[PDB]
Symmetry: D2
Subunit: 253 residues, 4 copies
């Protein structure tokens, strides 16, 4: 079995691939632009990936990897400003470049399924786009399109911390994402099946992608305060779910 993992509480470093307005300051990962006084900026776009590619599966052996990630984000909107556009955890092709800004979170080009996009993302959408979004602020699983295949309402606590944990169990082909606002003792969960070998390439780059609104009053910040990732690729077809018990304590908590 092949294993790769990491856990960063502090951010300074070449261990990441930054694109767009993504930057590292005060040890935290700032995905979108921010003025000197600290207020967010419109029409922004930033992405950030681990410098080492991860193997999601192996065509030759039939092995599919089980992985898991957890990170803490802090989304803040200025006093009287509205939220937009959101942040997404994504698995993209290795050389990949940003895509459509605004409501496309910098990861997709359309709301129609396009297998060739080879991108899967878990989004935390803070602005409802009438063309494809549900009426509320939600969490959703996007498979090669900006139109999620499953969503759940989400009550975004402005400025408060968010603890996210996403996992993919190869044994059941299930992708589960959960969110918790410790401050409010509120918690959300969502799960759906995904045939990962069909949607993504053998190797992918894992990281984040965020965007702000295209207008003056639709802005917010996207700070990643910490990030953990673990992936395990077996040798035979026989998949083996990960050990989240040992993972969270050895990594998150």
């Amino acid at each position: 079995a092949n294993i790769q993992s990491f856990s960063f509480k502090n951010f300074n470093s070449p261990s990441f691939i930054l694109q767009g307005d993504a930057t590292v300051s005060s040890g935290k990962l700032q995905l979108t632009k921010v003025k000197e006084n600290g207020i967010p900026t419109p029409s922004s776009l930033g992405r950030a990936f681990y410098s080492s590619p991860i193997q999601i599966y192996d065509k030759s052996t039939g092995a599919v990897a089980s992985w898991a990630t957890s990170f803490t984000v802090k989304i803040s909107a200025p006093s009287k400003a509205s939220f937009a556009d959101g942040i997404a955890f994504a698995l993209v092709p290795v050389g990949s470049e940003p895509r459509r800004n605004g409501g496309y979170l910098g990861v997709f080009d359309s709301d129609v399924y396009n297998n060739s996009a080879q991108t899967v993302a878990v989004e935390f959408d803070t602005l409802s786009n009438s063309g494809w979004d549900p009426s509320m602020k939600h969490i959703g699983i996007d498979v090669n399109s900006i139109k999620s295949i499953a969503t759940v309402s989400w009550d975004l606590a402005n400025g408060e911390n968010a603890e996210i944990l996403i996992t993919y169990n190869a044994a059941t082909s299930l992708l589960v994402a959960s969110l918790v606002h410790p401050s409010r003792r509120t918690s959300y969960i969502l799960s759906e099946r995904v045939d990962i070998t069909n949607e993504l390439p053998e190797y992918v780059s894992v990281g984040f992608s965020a965007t702000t609104g295209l207008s003056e009053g639709y802005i917010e910040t996207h700070d990643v305060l910490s990030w953990s990732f673990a992936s395990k690729l077996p040798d035979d077809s026989t998949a083996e779910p990960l050990d989240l018990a040992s993972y969270l304590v050895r990594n998150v908590l």
Copy 2:
């Protein structure tokens, strides 16, 4: 820091402390009685704990441990029979003996708060007891009483597997439990704050407790198919949440 952990996929062994009708057969952990033909039996009660005590916190240093567990249960009810009574993951005092059967799951004596019980449990209640239960089948956090301080409805898929993951983050004093029925792609989550140092002793025994109905038609089986546990106790007051990423992959998946 002190760390203890384990992960069992197969069950034969002296590594566990069995009480009541709990037994190990075919490598799986059977908490309640079952006839030879396999049908469950009424008025049953079984408990099972890891033979090694775990330190939840240290009074001298002010350190509080962050821990996490995950296990797969399979609850089945005979053809025309009703469900009852349920299974619970519990943290009990080291020498502890079973308690009230039936709707008390063998862990509590009353539905009134009694700090001296020194027991905290996450229950998966399959029968609503009019005296203290919500109208549905639920998941709940019980703190020194059989009356949960928080619950969530749960649609028990008869005979299908259930994947549970419970975590306690000392940093936020938050207890979160989630359940997933892979077969149905359904998932539940529940979170509440718990002041662990006040409800439990410094050392506890971790394991399961289950019971069947007191009548002929209220029966079900309680099979634990696998179990993982990880606990981390720091040296100073400064708590440190676990790494669930590395935990799940190194333990569950």
Copy 3:
């Protein structure tokens, strides 16, 4: 696969089974008797084991476990006193009681092979017993007898810390033990093949055993400052050596 592991940097607790004069004080594990002023005492004997049994192999499946341990010991002898008798890391039968004191380290009864003793130990002998010991202080692998099947000279740095790491790789049936005196920058290693399934039972208790000399001038202390242990038992015959890289960093360093 089944996995058990732990790592203690502080010692207070019921997580251990103490025998003889073994005691826990100031958070360190003191295997032998010490008067109040701190000087060691003659004819002493103490043992200490993890309260949870470990499965070394499974007769039914043919699986043999690969394990590893690391601990820091501090052996001190009073001013003008000689060293004796030594400390040993041992794998003994679950219910086992101490054995011969003095030069038998409390784990063996004779210097003749006796398969029924079902005991394997890595010893750090500080006194040469003319009947079976080499001329100098050594490290040795004892298999069902006090007469090691392999040894290596060892220059015991009085009062200085000793970092020991022992591993058993089921794939090559090799037992390797190494010692390092950071203070002097000295290091020792020893390796030999052991057919574990033939020398020990399916379940064993892991821990330490130490003894002091039977005379007034042959004394020393045996303090364990920290201890880590990890064991992995596969499902099929196919053995899988452990990951010492991830083990040491997540446990020792």
Copy 4:
């Protein structure tokens, strides 16, 4: 604390940075050139590093990382051919390019200390270079020069597997390397103190470097069969040695 780690038993992938004649074939890492019939080739040079940089320490906080690695190499020399030149595990500056071939293993330029080389390597020298080498084949710790600051004789078992484990404990500033030839039951160890913050930059690239002889009869192969790595960087000056117990079992064994 920041943590990075990986464990590869199979080699196909972009996760590595190959230089020179390094190549990946049949899933194993071949550091030097080999003709089609499989025989080694003279004047060869290949290097290979993990695509993600690792932080050895942080100037701002005073934190120094404790790390550990383990890998299995197979060195083979054609029938009547002599051995040369050797393989080395190295920590080099991020953008670094190969250096002198032959007896310089592709990592150093001279046998005189040159702090500006910013390179530390553990070498497994298979040919004694009269200018700076000891008389026999050895294992050595090289700090900014090809002239080791410490060495140990080594009996290279031709064609047999070699299991290497290297660790650096920030707490004691000690670098320890050990080698084991399972086939012969032989084992070697070497330890010395290294002030890592003074010899290397904050960020380095970890991997291997190997070379063959410059003549027709001084050739051998350099196959890496597996590789594990784990690094942990604390937040304050207070260093914390890794857990090799949990590392080896979760990674090597």
